[PDB]
Ligand binder design. Structure first.
Ligand SMILES: Nc1ncnc2c1ncn2[C@@H]1O[C@H](CSCC[C@H](N)C(=O)O)[C@@H](O)[C@H]1O
Length: 313
């Protein structure tokens, strides 16, 4: 029978999308999240999946037992300590666990607790720090990953006391392959004041580029350090526009900066770069800002999918 998957801290459902891509015999029995905005997006894309809009800390052991899950997929931002407290009390321990977190987690106290708990329960595990660029995706998103399997023999690729920086046994695609034809360029052009203020601090990429900076939840609202911006103007070079800036009045610098036709990648384009399927979308009521915020909290579906494949077989 198919594995019963519990999806905690579900968000827009990146774990569920990764589960479907992995092709393994499994189905999400319960997705859990308190955020009503994330949940409307999740339900919209996964209308037949049980979604529990509840605090994870408030879920009792009985509720977890009734779910009878064989795999936990989670991206914890208390609720986490509760999960750890619940594990040794479950009538049926899940055979699989996959956790995603941020760089630095691998040295944290919380991580030390997680590993102690899972080791005490008989799980073989391996930690990783992976970015989508390792899979030929032109977008950086270095994240922590822990895969664990309930068995006696170590995973074949195990490296004790080490965090693996690559997938166990790239040719990067261009950004053009992830752009949407129907993108309303004018709508996404960076505004004048933002161009001038952040002019020298932008990471400008062209469609033929095979890299882009990590997108944060603030992308599209805050300029600096939140993700690359796209040059849509052809037959103009960034270098020539920037050379022209010294000695021009601020209004003149803006005129020059607008020529590059720099625009934000759209929420759908970020979802594409994150590996979300073609049909993935958002309800009309979800604002562009909410879309960027939700995607910023999500994960790269392709990376997790490959890790699920590794963990399962
Ligand atoms: N105590 C808690 N109970 C339930 N959900 C929680 C929670 N604390 C955080 N969350 C949710 O966990 C998420 C952390 S972001 C995880 C996003 C998800 N991996 C994705 O594919 O979108 C947020 O959606 C947040 O609302």
């Amino acid at each position: 029978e198919p594995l019963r998957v519990l999806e905690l801290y579900s968000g827009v459902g990146g774990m569920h999308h990764a589960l479907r891509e992995s092709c393994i015999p499994a189905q999400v029995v319960a997705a859990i999240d308190v955020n009503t905005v994330a949940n409307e997006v999740y339900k919209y894309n996964f209308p037949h999946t049980q979604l529990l809009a509840k605090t994870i800390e408030g879920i009792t052991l009985e509720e977890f037992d009734r779910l009878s899950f064989d795999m936990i997929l989670m991206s914890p931002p208390n609720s986490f300590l509760h999960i750890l407290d619940i594990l040794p009390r479950l009538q049926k321990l899940p055979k699989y666990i996959l956790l995603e977190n941020v760089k630095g987690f691998e040295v944290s106290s919380t991580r030390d607790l997680l590993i102690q708990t899972i080791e005490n329960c008989g799980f073989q595990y391996q930690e990783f720090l992976l970015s989508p660029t390792s899979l030929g995706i032109p977008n950086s998103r270095l994240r922590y990953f822990l895969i664990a399997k309930l068995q006696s023999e170590p995973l074949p690729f195990q490296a004790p006391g080490q965090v693996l920086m690559e997938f166990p046994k790239l040719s990067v695609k261009m950004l053009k392959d992830f752009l949407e034809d129907d993108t309303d360029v004018n709508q996404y052009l960076l505004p004048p004041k933002s161009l001038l203020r952040y002019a020298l601090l932008l990471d400008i990429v062209q469609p033929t580029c095979r890299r882009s900076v990590c997108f944060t939840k603030g992308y599209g609202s805050y300029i600096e350090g939140t993700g690359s911006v796209l040059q849509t103007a052809e037959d103009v070079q960034v270098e020539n526009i920037y050379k022209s800036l010294t000695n021009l009045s601020q209004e003149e610098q803006i005129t020059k900066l607008l020529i590059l036709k720099l625009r934000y990648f759209t929420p759908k384009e970020i979802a594409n770069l994150l590996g979300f399927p073609p049909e993935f979308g958002f309800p009309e009521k979800i604002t562009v800002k909410q879309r960027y915020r939700l995607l910023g909290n999500s994960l790269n579906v392709h990376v997790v999918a490959k890790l699920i494949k590794i963990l399962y077989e």
